[PDB]
């Protein structure tokens, strides 16, 4: 429970993260183009 | 949970760390002499497939 | 986490039953002589911490303050298999080596001598001790260094750890052997006396029982003070197994001790062990059952009380509860309290609720058991009075006989009478007469 | 505790839903252009 | 660049200790005593630089400087494997060859009149350090040359690199046991009054702790004057260690001690480190716990300062940094804390931000560990007051019946009075005020 609800959220956090990254330099190479 | 386990020869097992402590309800204030005052805590157990399928929800609510 | 307890090795007595207890305890948990933890020893199970420290994280060294007035003890100690074990700088020897000549005030000052040492190593055990309650001292109170020094290191105890609770296991001298420590009975007056003052609970041990134990049931026509010693040790460790192997109960002391001390002032307890068998029969493993295991601690030979044959109390168990380690059927303890019932092999006080309570402990993984199935019973029984009762006799039959004084007026506590004996024998007798009360409905109105 | 985290978790899935579906769309129109 | 650490060496004993601590310093860098880097150092993780520096293109020299008032301690640095470590001209010799007569007052008068050839050694090592944090000035308190003379050096260190940081490693002299150097008092003041003045961080080593823990933990029953030079010279590794070994932190000696020093005059120090071994008692590996690392680093005897057992003070120490190398249980080190607790091994200020750093490093392949697992803790810690207070008291009860003051009086700075003596031991009585407000919150408003 306790262990599986913090390792949803630490997981759900670092995809999240991962997937802002990859937005921002998404955005970073559309406004180089 | 981190003094016990590590007061306890078995706490710092990897049996040990399925161990989770929730809370079933969060209570206004602590009845004094109530012998149920802890009851609000559970230890939980998790079951990966297909041992859920055996070991089900019910079971692990039981043994909380 | 465990209740530790750090253990005081006082006189030639004392000494020897550490000796022995480190020896137990090193094999039980694979411990080498040194204290290093053996190669077969992989079951870290064990609660070390509770009685040991860790010297290294393979050298484990016991949590224990050796205080004594002889120096020969001390020397058996360095020639004994748990000399490595401890600490050197945790053991205090006597410097002058003459011993408190068979005095406990000669002991009790060589131990105030040696008190600032004493109570250093005492502090230094408990440092060792992740959970320390306070201080268990083991000595005789027989001899002169033992019995001194075991009064002087209680009262460091008490001294160092006044809000925490001090238990003795004192060893009063056998009744029904001729001590050779003649001053036996003023020695045992002094160390019970220090029992009243400085410590909260006396376990109260009968030399005698252990003699007569050791030539019944260990077939030892002369149990030495070193081989009694080295039989209340093996009794000490089955009792404590459950504390050093923590499991389901008695993982503590005071959990194992609740149910026995039912006052404040009724805390001399007696103990029991089942099923009782011979250091020499180890080898046939008989499956005793609980019934079996019950039938056997009413035995005499396994109980570690020798209490007179009181013929105008009817003295009586108040409560007695049995913590069973090993393979135990709970239909072998139902059967058990069965046979109990049926033979009436408890008695129990009828003012109140009580019962047998039962503590499962694990056993050492390292060490073979001779038994499937091992018990310590912790029990109020008012016959334990009668421990208390003869080593006040005893003490007040020598302080009036002055028997053997000349050797405890060389020190001054000692040096023109023994009323601080005959005070201890008095107060040891009021101990007595309240156990006994215990057995009887009006023990809620004592005090 | 139990329900905070499954808020927590809840609150990171929806970021991470809006952040899929957003690079979704980046994807979709850096392949228009 | 690494930050380099100029070594002064004063007097026999502190020469003595000087050249054992650099031999030391070459083993963990891999440098041969003749200043030849070693085949085996191949992990070039090590800051050389940190301890020697480079006096040509191609021979390290350790940055050591050997300063005597008699000629036998720098002939036999000159006589010694270490030889080759010190830049000749960073050795200066008494020509008398008389030495300080055990008299601190000599002693620093040696050092004023070595003082051109100090300050040229320190001068010399900056120049040659690219990035040279300061001078650590090893010496010894009980004689009268080592600490007089290495009272000099620090002077000089911090004039001759004024603007860069120095530490300093300063053994106090044993104030509890009866010194056959009857002016060690004044010295040991002495001492204390240079490392509160002039460096920033003081790790006391009291040959006594000294003693104490090669008996307790080295298992040494009679400790020589040699190991105890060696127990001093291990304590100033332990405290330059984050100089010599750089890492994510604490690289630089200035960096390292700010963590450690609040106030520049609660600068008292006291060091421990655990396991400590003597360099016979290698044999037996002790499995030494995080427990029992953390226990024997904050025992006292295991402390490389001889602080009193006051049961009435909470001493405390102002910062701790263990550096542990190793396989590390995190459940060995909860227990650890959690003992430490329950036993209140440690305690630390309260009135300012303090903990341990750790930096994860290679071991160096040169350097022979006696341990499995190791761990340097560098702290200030309260109770080296309690050394520098007995110093102190001790100074002021030699210089108030004037004893060993005739051999001083030989030398100019007492020809006249015992002044400096005096100073000395006020210079270390404030200090060990300082050290000893360090452990309380009180400490923001110490030597107001």
């Given at each position: 429970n306790?262990?599986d609800?913090?390792?949803?959220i630490?997981?759900?956090?670092?995809?999240?993260?991962?997937?802002?990254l990859?937005?921002?330099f998404?955005?970073?190479?559309?406004?180089?183009? | 949970?981190s003094?016990?386990?590590?007061?306890?020869?078995?706490?710092?097992?990897?049996?040990?760390?399925?161990?989770?402590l929730?809370?079933?309800?969060l209570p206004?204030?602590?009845?004094?002499?109530?012998?149920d005052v802890?009851?609000?805590?559970?230890?939980?157990?998790?079951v990966?497939?297909?041992?859920?399928?055996?070991?089900?929800?019910g079971?692990?609510?039981?043994?909380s | 986490?465990?209740?530790?307890?750090?253990?005081?090795?006082?006189?030639?007595?004392?000494?020897?039953?550490?000796?022995?207890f480190?020896?137990?305890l090193?094999?039980?948990?694979?411990?080498?002589?040194?204290?290093?933890?053996?190669?077969?020893?992989?079951?870290?199970?064990?609660?070390?911490?509770v009685?040991?420290?860790?010297?290294?994280?393979?050298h484990?060294?016991?949590?224990?303050?050796?205080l004594?007035?002889?120096?020969?003890?001390?020397?058996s100690?360095l020639?004994?298999?748990?000399?490595?074990?401890?600490?050197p700088?945790?053991?205090?020897?006597?410097?002058?080596?003459?011993?408190?000549?068979?005095?406990?005030?000669?002991?009790?000052?060589q131990?105030?001598?040696i008190?600032?040492?004493?109570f250093?190593?005492?502090?230094?055990?408990?440092?060792?001790?992740?959970?320390?309650?306070?201080?268990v001292?083991?000595?005789?109170?027989?001899?002169?260094?033992?019995?001194?020094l075991?009064?002087?290191?209680?009262?460091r105890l008490n001294?160092?750890?006044?809000?925490?609770?001090?238990?003795?296991?004192?060893?009063?001298?056998n009744?029904?052997?001729?001590?050779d420590?003649?001053?036996?009975?003023?020695?045992?007056?002094?160390?019970?006396?220090?029992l009243?003052?400085?410590?909260?609970?006396?376990?109260?041990?009968d030399?005698?029982?252990?003699?007569?134990?050791?030539?019944?049931?260990?077939?030892?026509?002369?149990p030495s003070?070193?081989?009694?010693?080295?039989?209340?040790?093996?009794?000490?460790?089955?009792?404590?197994?459950?504390?050093?192997?923590p499991?389901?109960?008695?993982?503590?002391?005071?959990?194992?001790?609740?149910?026995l001390?039912?006052?404040?002032?009724?805390?001399?307890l007696?103990?029991?062990?089942?099923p009782?068998?011979?250091?020499?029969?180890?080898?046939?493993?008989?499956?005793?059952?609980?019934?079996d295991?019950?039938?056997?601690?009413?035995?005499?030979?396994?109980?570690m009380?020798?209490?007179?044959?009181?013929?105008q109390?009817?003295?009586?168990?108040?409560?007695?509860?049995?913590?069973?380690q090993?393979?135990?059927?709970p239909?072998?303890?139902?059967?058990?309290?069965?046979?109990?019932?049926?033979?009436?092999?408890?008695?129990?006080?009828?003012?109140?609720?009580?019962?047998?309570?039962?503590?499962?402990?694990?056993?050492?993984?390292?060490?073979?058991?001779?038994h499937?199935?091992?018990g310590?019973?912790?029990?109020?029984?008012?016959?334990?009075?009668?421990?208390?009762?003869?080593?006040?006799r005893?003490?007040?039959?020598?302080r009036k006989?002055?028997?053997?004084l000349?050797?405890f007026?060389?020190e001054?506590?000692?040096?023109?009478?023994?009323?601080?004996?005959?005070?201890?024998?008095e107060?040891?007798?009021q101990?007595?007469?309240e156990?006994?009360?215990?057995?009887?409905?009006?023990?809620?109105?004592w005090?």
């Open positions: 306790m262990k609800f913090e390792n949803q630490t997981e759900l956090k670092k995809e999240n993260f991962n997937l802002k990859r937005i921002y998404l955005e970073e190479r559309m406004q180089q183009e | 949970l003094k016990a386990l590590q007061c306890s020869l078995h706490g710092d097992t990897p049996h040990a760390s399925n161990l989770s929730a809370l079933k309800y206004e204030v602590f009845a004094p002499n109530a012998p802890l009851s609000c805590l559970e230890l939980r157990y998790k990966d497939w297909p041992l859920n399928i055996v070991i089900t929800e079971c692990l609510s039981k043994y | 986490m465990p209740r530790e307890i750090i253990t005081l090795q006082l006189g030639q007595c004392g000494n020897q039953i550490g000796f022995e480190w020896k137990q090193c094999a039980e948990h694979g411990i080498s002589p040194e204290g290093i933890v053996e190669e077969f020893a992989t079951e870290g199970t064990d609660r070390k911490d009685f040991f420290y860790q010297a290294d994280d393979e484990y060294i016991p949590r224990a303050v050796l004594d007035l002889e120096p020969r003890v001390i020397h100690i020639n004994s298999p748990y000399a490595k074990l401890y600490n700088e945790n053991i205090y020897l006597s410097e002058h080596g003459g011993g408190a000549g068979n005095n406990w005030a000669s002991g009790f000052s131990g105030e001598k008190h600032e040492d004493i250093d190593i005492i502090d230094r055990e408990a440092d060792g001790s992740d959970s320390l309650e306070g201080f001292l083991c000595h005789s109170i027989a001899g002169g260094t033992g019995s001194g075991g009064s002087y290191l209680l009262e001294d160092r750890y006044p809000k925490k609770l001090v238990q003795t296991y004192s060893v009063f001298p009744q029904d052997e001729m001590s420590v003649v001053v036996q009975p003023y020695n045992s007056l002094l160390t019970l006396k220090r009243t003052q400085n410590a909260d609970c006396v376990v109260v041990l030399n005698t029982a252990l003699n007569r134990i050791a030539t019944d049931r260990l077939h030892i026509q002369n003070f070193s081989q009694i010693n080295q039989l209340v040790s093996t009794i000490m460790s089955a009792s404590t197994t459950t504390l050093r192997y499991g389901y109960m008695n993982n503590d002391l005071i959990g194992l001790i609740a149910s001390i039912p006052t404040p002032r009724l805390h001399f007696m103990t029991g062990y089942t009782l068998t011979t250091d020499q029969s180890v080898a046939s493993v008989r499956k005793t059952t609980v019934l295991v019950m039938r056997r601690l009413l035995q005499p030979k396994n109980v009380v020798s209490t007179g044959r009181d013929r109390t009817n003295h009586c168990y108040i409560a007695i509860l049995n913590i069973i090993g393979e135990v059927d239909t072998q303890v139902h059967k058990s309290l069965q046979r109990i019932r049926e033979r009436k092999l408890a008695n129990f006080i009828p003012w109140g609720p009580a019962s047998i309570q039962v503590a499962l402990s694990r056993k050492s993984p390292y060490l073979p058991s001779a499937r199935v091992s310590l019973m912790m029990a109020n029984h008012t016959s334990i009075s009668s421990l208390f009762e003869r080593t006040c005893q003490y007040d039959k020598l006989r002055e028997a053997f000349e050797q007026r060389k001054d506590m000692f040096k023109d009478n023994f009323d601080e004996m005959d005070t201890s024998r107060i040891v007798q101990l007595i007469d156990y006994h009360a215990a057995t009887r409905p009006d023990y809620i109105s005090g």
